[PDB]
Design an enzyme around this catalytic site. Structure first.
Site, PDB file in Angstrom:
ATOM      1  N   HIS B  64       0.800  -1.211   0.000  1.00 27.20           N
ATOM      2  CA  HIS B  64       0.000   0.000   0.000  1.00 27.20           C
ATOM      3  C   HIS B  64       0.834   1.263   0.000  1.00 27.20           C
ATOM      4  CE1 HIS B  64      -3.143  -2.836   1.019  1.00 27.20           C
ATOM      5  NE2 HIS B  64      -2.565  -3.128   2.171  1.00 27.20           N
ATOM      6  N   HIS B  89       5.444   7.418   6.110  1.00 30.64           N
ATOM      7  CA  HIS B  89       5.194   6.708   4.858  1.00 30.64           C
ATOM      8  C   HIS B  89       4.680   7.732   3.854  1.00 30.64           C
ATOM      9  CE1 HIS B  89       1.301   6.546   6.983  1.00 30.64           C
ATOM     10  NE2 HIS B  89       0.849   6.826   5.778  1.00 30.64           N
ATOM     11  N   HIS B  91       2.497   8.913   0.021  1.00 28.46           N
ATOM     12  CA  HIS B  91       1.392   8.800  -0.915  1.00 28.46           C
ATOM     13  C   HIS B  91       1.691   9.615  -2.164  1.00 28.46           C
ATOM     14  CE1 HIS B  91      -1.165   6.883   2.142  1.00 28.46           C
ATOM     15  NE2 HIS B  91      -0.724   7.807   2.978  1.00 28.46           N
ATOM     16  N   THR B 175      -6.210   7.393   7.018  1.00 30.56           N
ATOM     17  CA  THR B 175      -6.658   7.371   5.630  1.00 30.56           C
ATOM     18  C   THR B 175      -6.585   5.989   5.006  1.00 30.56           C
ATOM     19  OG1 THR B 175      -4.494   7.989   4.708  1.00 30.56           O
ATOM     20  CG2 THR B 175      -5.978   9.766   5.376  1.00 30.56           C
ATOM     21  N   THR B 176      -6.199   4.979   5.772  1.00 30.07           N
ATOM     22  CA  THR B 176      -6.324   3.590   5.385  1.00 30.07           C
ATOM     23  C   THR B 176      -7.138   2.848   6.443  1.00 30.07           C
ATOM     24  OG1 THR B 176      -4.260   2.980   6.489  1.00 30.07           O
ATOM     25  CG2 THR B 176      -4.106   3.650   4.173  1.00 30.07           C
TER      26      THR B 176
HETATM   27 ZN   LIG Z   1      -0.783   8.012   5.071  1.00 30.30          ZN
END
Ligand SMILES: [Zn+2]
Ligand SMILES: [Zn+2]
Lengths: 225, 225
Positions: B64, B89, B91, B175-176
């Site tokens: 992801h 992490h 995006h 957001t996940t």
């Molecule tokens: Zn994130």
């Protein structure tokens, strides 16, 4: 399995009672303590309030409050959206706290936009002069749960708002089950007045306090106009 | 049961994949479009960021995102609470929008206090000069899902932040999945830069965009320091 403000079906257990009440345990619940640690000042829009008279509204004792239905056509405009006034009802003592302190009485004006999104205006009451529009409702208030009467008078909900329209704004929930979130709360800073007798008649009819305890602010801030 | 950013197990169907994902359909979700319509300036505290080096962190491609584990002892202090940095992490394109615009790249620094409450710092990247921290991670990032490597270098997450520490603040969610709410979001105003090569390699390894679509703001405001 009726939810209540006390006992085994009281507010700490609401989310357990019913699959629809899952909101009552989440992160953006109302009411809140309005305290300095998490209120900030901001340039907020003027309140736009467009209320007409309600002709002969129904007055309901639903066992948790006294609720007054409002005929369609009255609305507020917030962020461009019209929210139509649906009903108003009462809590004693206040649900919202101001720097840790209760008011003796609070009115909630419940609005919904055309998609059903909710906005609530909260008005505090202090002991003082009898409120005569309150006196019209109190005169006919059903004393037992599940009872409804028709008021044979016109009333304008504007007369239950302060003339000064400064407010607090935050994102919260309904304060009774199902406690749906995404509710826009607008709490007016200036209280209006009701008599001690008007407040105590409401309390004896309710038989118990009917305010939900204040809820964790979590990651929210309260905005002050 | 597996979730993804597209298709039958994509963002609109996340809540159906797992009872634990019920949050994903509620009213205080992230990311959001940072829009003038619901953004206001405010007197907000200065960010307090106390990050030390992380020696040889783990880097994981979990299918992801590319996630970097951070060693204990670095934290932010917000509203008097210590949130320890756990991981950051990435995006592409960005999750948050500004005025309806994506940035090519966004970093999330995920923090949790001692009870597991979450605070996330978001940093926008625009295409420009190469970032030197990113360069170290990108050199050895796993190219396939389900792979882990140890970085053989020390890094300081403070070098992935802008110098200017003005920010947007709002109450939101992961957001996940499980999309837990109650998350304090801090989005830094000033973008920093990644090179074209850095953006292209990340997008190439992810194979597809890995950003959740923006979510309805509902009753929230975004505060600007
Ligand atoms: Zn994130
Ligand atoms: Zn109420």
């Amino acid at each position: 399995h009726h939810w209540s403000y006390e006992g085994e079906n009281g507010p700490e257990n609401w989310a357990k009672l019913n699959p629809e009440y899952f909101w009552c345990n989440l992160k953006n619940q109302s009411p809140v303590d309005i305290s300095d640690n998490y209120k900030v000042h901001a340039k907020l829009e003027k309140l736009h309030i467009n209320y007409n008279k309600a002709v002969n509204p129904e007055i309901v004792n639903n066992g948790h409050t006294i609720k007054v239905s409002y005929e369609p056509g009255s609305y507020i405009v917030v962020d461009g959206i019209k929210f139509e006034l649906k009903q108003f009802h009462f809590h004693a003592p206040s649900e919202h706290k101001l720097k840790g302190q209760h008011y003796p009485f609070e009115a909630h004006f419940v609005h919904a936009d055309k998609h059903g999104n909710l906005a609530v205006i909260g008005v505090f009451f202090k002991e003082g002069r009898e409120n005569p529009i309150l006196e019209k409702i109190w005169k006919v208030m059903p004393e037992n749960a599940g009872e409804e009467v028709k008021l044979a008078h016109k009333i304008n909900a504007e007369d239950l708002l302060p003339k000064d329209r400064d407010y607090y704004r935050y994102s919260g929930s309904l304060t009774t089950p199902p406690c749906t979130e995404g509710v826009l709360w607008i709490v007016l800073k200036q209280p209006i007045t009701a008599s001690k007798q008007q407040i105590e008649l409401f309390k004896s009819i309710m038989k118990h306090n009917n305010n939900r305890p204040t809820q964790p602010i979590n990651s929210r801030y309260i905005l002050e106009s």
